[PDB]
Symmetry: C5
Subunit: 238 residues, 5 copies
């Protein structure tokens, strides 16, 4: 067997997947939820085809593909992109596990790279069947009419619905070229409504401001430093 | 088994295949027929070697290789190019299914990239045996004397005929560098005669005009906008 | 099993192979013989690793690797280059078949890319053993002393001789950069002497003249057309 | 199987691994310890996927992946980088061996590429569990809070701890672009404290000085030589 | 099984291997010995992963990897480089054969690419164990202290010694960028002393002179020809 899921059964699990993707939208959202709900590391994906590494998080070695849990919610995180065939093999194992445990919901978190000059960033959605499309509509999420969703999200959407599970994908609009905690927040907001979780997305919006403030400040200091050096060169040498 | 066909039996099926190819001729033709005959999604190809995705069509997740049906006609569609060995594996499974169900006809839809400065775009044809060549001649389709037909179309032509099925390929002449709904229409016209379907190719010809009108109009507005900006720069700054 | 030879037994077969190669010498020679001896398509090579296609010849679908026959002569043709390991696998199956049927002769047709400024184009030869070298000498074919022969020809030469079959390769000298029906003719001439076939190589030499006449004429008309356009531009605009 | 560990059992082994990596920090450290503790070559990794070579050390042929030993300490050395899947396969076999022999400690030596203009080069650490983190803290090694450790080190850290073994990684800060015996020395110092070995890191610090002195001296002589040649050209030819 | 050695048993064989490598030193040496000792072609390596070809030597088809013999000495020759894993597989089969027949010596011939401006070209050596190092010392061959020997030579050295066979590598220093019959001669001289063969290396040194004389002469005639053409252009056209 190329891929082994090492993951305890969690009956009627709500499974949320945020693999790396455009904007890191899914990934930031999933990681934020795992943190804010004080989830434990409950399992991981094991395969010879996952390249050798340990991530170190709060001084604990963790594998690159892992599962976090707090009673009934599982969150699936990855820190690497993976080749297509391996993704498919992992998706197979995940869907087997979700059938086994009669998972209540299968939710994939994703990003949609969508220009620069858009006023507000929406969250789009798609459901396994018309029933799930209706649910998403009733949380005021725009349903995606035409498109493609590649990667784990796209495969889970199809595979999980085909196995009779209620499956969804949320796609936060983002620039498409950078980590975007704001778009992740939009997605986490939709997830609050969907699951009644009441997690504040403030720390996420704070994080975004602090990054942008830091960038502005570093650019200021860089340019101020070269202007000082030019003025200094001229007074010394003209 | 590398490829699983998930497809109910349709006795004495007329199987039509329009995989992506030059001009998207086959693909547009097949997709148009599926739509205009209000076909249902009846099946799909499943394989670890098909890269992970869902297509979203009218807000429903669908796999990239799928089958549409309406009583006795099956239409095979793909939204991705596929590597040669996988194509061969899919062809094997398709031909097995068509033997099983005693398919009446196996028709591949394709394009022939053929210059720019040709007055009219023809439709060529080829049959599994001289019997099918004769049929195509009697619908005034030119028989291809010398050529190669690569991809699924070429393989099905040979494999299906070798298994005792009546097999054909229709090739719409096209530019060779762009989606061509007009050439698809030519092919759909030939398919009407062949199967007595009376599907209007008007919406297809309309679609082509609207695309071209839109392009012309956007190019007009683009060029008019830069001329305005030049005039504006000059009045402001000369 | 990666490669299946679908080929009826032909006792004491004279097997001639002309796979694509420098100059298309082998290939043109083999194809010409098959045509001029009104051979039938008697079989083919079947493998998932042969890329999907049908060639269309005289309006009949044929596979890319095929066998032509007329009582006791088999001619093996291919329309594609193939990767080394697959070539070896095909060679194995071919040699098994030739042992089975006690083949009388195993002849590979090939080209030798050899400069531009040579007056005459020779045909070289090599035999499985000194006995076959002697035969070739007695038809005034130069024996190749040192060299390598890659591809199917080289493998068959060795494998067929090692299985106790009389094996040969004929190599028509050619430019090395273009289809050369003249060099093919040289090879077919040697094959006439070797097998007493009396096939005229005139149509081949005719074909070469007509191609060269067409090229000269097109180049004339091209250059005459731009001279006319220059004269026309000058009279219009000076 | 694809990888065979040829290695005698050493009960309750202290296993130290220094595979090549940034700075050659791990590698230099491990190699130095093996030498200074007069270890014997006790085993090696054998695999068809290890490229064919012998290293020659003190006139003895040795394989590229080898194990050195002196009563209870095993040191694992490699002289080549290896592809990820092979690394994982080797890690599997190593961890199996370490379970078998109830290894006391599993220590990976590594480097951390970390800029140029840093005052001191530290040594960081990480442990399989909080118990080992505590040990490292009590030798005044900074515990790594966040990061990733790729390669054999990262995999062993996780795999060995998951099999109930006490596992650690030491990471010497280094420039990141060159062999760094100084950083290796820092790591060997930490290893002395951890295992009570009292190995002098002087020869290592000496080695670093001699390399740097040699570089400076060669650059001096090069530049002095071209200045002499310029002066000589001018006196000869002006 | 990927590689079959077709090679009669030769009890207590002296096995000499000269696979292509830097300078073609090994290869020229091995080939020269096979010729000068009037060896017969006794066997070959057979594998689907050896690319299809025949070499033609004195008008006989031979495989690219072959074995020459004269009572008790086997010489292994290859005319192609091979991928690492295949080399390892061939080495496995060779060492199995050498255990089977209780081979007396396993000698690899190789080159060491080593600059341009060296007065004399030495021959270095290395032995499987200290016993063989001593033998080589007693024929005044310098023992290599540190280095790596890649390819078949390196693998045989290790594998054959690990199977209890007496194994050696001789490395002729050479430029590193061209066929070097002189360095091959140096190696053949050492092989004479080692095995008491008294083969004159004169024809080899003669061959080198004739090549160099030919090069000088061709370069002379080339340059003399363009000078003549310049003089001729000037007298015609000034
Ligand atoms: Cl990341
Ligand atoms: Cl200045
Ligand atoms: Cl498309
Ligand atoms: Cl201006
Ligand atoms: Cl061709
Ligand atoms: Cl190294
Ligand atoms: Cl001067
Ligand atoms: Cl060579």
């Amino acid at each position: 067997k190329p891929v082994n899921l090492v993951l305890p059964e969690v009956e009627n699990a709500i499974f949320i997947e945020g693999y790396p993707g455009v904007g890191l939208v899914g990934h930031i959202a999933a990681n934020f939820l795992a943190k804010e709900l004080d989830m434990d590391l409950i399992g991981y994906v094991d395969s010879l085809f996952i390249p050798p590494m340990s991530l170190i998080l709060e001084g604990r070695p963790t594998p690159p593909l892992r599962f976090y849990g707090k009673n009934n919610i599982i969150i699936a995180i990855a820190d690497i992109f993976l080749p297509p065939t391996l993704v498919n093999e992992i998706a197979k194992e995940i869907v087997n596990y979700l059938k086994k445990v009669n998972a209540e919901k299968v939710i994939s978190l994703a990003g949609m790279g969508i220009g620069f000059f858009k006023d507000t960033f929406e969250v789009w959605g798609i459901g396994g069947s018309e029933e799930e499309n209706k649910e998403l509509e009733s949380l005021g999420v725009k349903i995606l009419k035409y498109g493609s969703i590649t990667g784990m999200s796209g495969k889970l959407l199809w595979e999980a619905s085909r196995a009779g599970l209620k499956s969804y994908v949320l796609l936060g609009e983002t620039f498409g070229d950078r980590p975007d905690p704001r778009a992740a927040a939009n997605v986490v907001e939709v997830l609050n409504k969907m699951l009644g979780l009441n997690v504040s997305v403030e720390p996420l919006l704070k994080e975004a401001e602090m990054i942008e403030e830091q960038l502005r400040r570093m650019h200021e200091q860089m340019e101020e430093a070269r202007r000082k050096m030019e003025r200094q060169y001229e007074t010394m040498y003209l």
